[PDB]
Write an enzyme that holds these catalytic residues in place. Sequence first.
Site, PDB file in Angstrom:
ATOM      1  N   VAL A   1      39.076  43.321  44.985  1.00 42.47           N
ATOM      2  CA  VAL A   1      40.132  44.216  44.745  1.00 42.47           C
ATOM      3  C   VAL A   1      40.534  43.463  43.354  1.00 42.47           C
ATOM      4  CG1 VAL A   1      42.270  45.501  45.156  1.00 42.47           C
ATOM      5  CG2 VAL A   1      40.977  44.714  47.058  1.00 42.47           C
ATOM      6  N   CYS A   2      40.363  44.430  42.189  1.00 49.82           N
ATOM      7  CA  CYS A   2      40.979  43.766  41.047  1.00 49.82           C
ATOM      8  C   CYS A   2      42.346  44.221  40.812  1.00 49.82           C
ATOM      9  CB  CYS A   2      39.955  44.034  39.998  1.00 49.82           C
ATOM     10  SG  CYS A   2      40.313  43.099  38.297  1.00 49.82           S
TER      11      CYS A   2
END
Lengths: 65, 78, 156, 156
Positions: free
Chosen positions: D91-92
């Site tokens: 997850v950025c």
Amino acid sequence: SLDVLIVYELTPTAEQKALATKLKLPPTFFCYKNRPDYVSEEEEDDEDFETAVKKLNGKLYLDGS
Amino acid sequence: EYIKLKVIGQDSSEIHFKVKMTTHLKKLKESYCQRQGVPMNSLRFLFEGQRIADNHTPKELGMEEEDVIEVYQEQTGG
Amino acid sequence: ADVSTFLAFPSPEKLLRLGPKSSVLIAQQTDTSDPEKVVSAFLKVSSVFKDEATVRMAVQDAVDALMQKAFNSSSFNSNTFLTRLLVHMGLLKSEDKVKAIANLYGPLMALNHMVQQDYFPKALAPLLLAFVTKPNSALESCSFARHSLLQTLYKV
Amino acid sequence: SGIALSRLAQERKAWRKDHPFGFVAVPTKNPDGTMNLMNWECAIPGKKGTPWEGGLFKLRMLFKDDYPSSPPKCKFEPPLFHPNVYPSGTVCLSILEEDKDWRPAITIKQILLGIQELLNEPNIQDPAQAEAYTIYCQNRVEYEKRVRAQAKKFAP
């Protein structure tokens, strides 16, 4: 002009804030246990993730409790 | 006149404000930030689940007393 | 031994200096196994596409082969390619630090051709279409190459 | 690092005593039978109202020796369909990036809470996966339709 006065701000123990200060955590962290309800100083952590997910069994949104 | 509000952050940081229901909530917003050392933007305040306008005021939210406000650290995707 | 050195330091000429047996000397000497390497080759070859007559024909067939190979062997994820391709063409953020290539002309032209061939999975169609229309500095420093591909794609 | 194992230790206790409803953040365990703090197994609920409602999405959380200095890496297991989630499932998110919005004072309760908000506030203006960015732009009614699905598929 427009009056807005800060009347109260949750503050922790000298030892609490100082602990959090050591852990780079938000000063009001161990206030969870500073509360009146469920709190003490004894419990052994072990439950398995998977278990917990199921212990949750019912829906995930408390709405309707 | 005067309704005590409960601005609850997202890290157990609770703060109580007494505000005139004729004052722009921005004043409340701003206070928080400086009395907390955080740029006006950095955060975000909510009520009834939905966001809070910068010009808002109980004049529009009909916020009674004992109300609650949630603050969330501002972020974006990646 | 030739393809090797050609891949090290590309050239619009060195490619030609491989005889007609380059359109396969490369499309074989290359590890067609994993997408990442396919991407490396494909771009490398493309990096020397000149609208010229025989040079673009050399580049085209090179790509035509290299891809004809990989796209035909289930032991290859087409999407993983299209992705690592866009990531190398500075069009999409990678989870690491990739050296974005200078000009996307060669590729945008090489791609321009490939999408027309049949050995191309008409499924990756919109995913390329999306990342080419995607507002981006370099993919703008070649209005031509792009509008072309965009056109090519609008039809596929 | 500095005081990783302690802060983490604390965050677990704190988490047990108090924590958001519907969220799960149980660490793993070492061979020693002991508890593993450098690796947790979290699970974020959907979000009532949003089309992400219904499902419970698991995600791991690996911490480094440095914590809280540097943020924790986060991956959805299995990978999710969302504009800002790499194919690897990472997850950025601004908040989670050391050199950007990450500040030591941020806790796990926050991250998980943040990530949840992120599920429905995609930053298509900078995707991390072609797959979703495409569909999002290509057609919205579908992106939701795809979501409603992914959510049910992960409903407890």
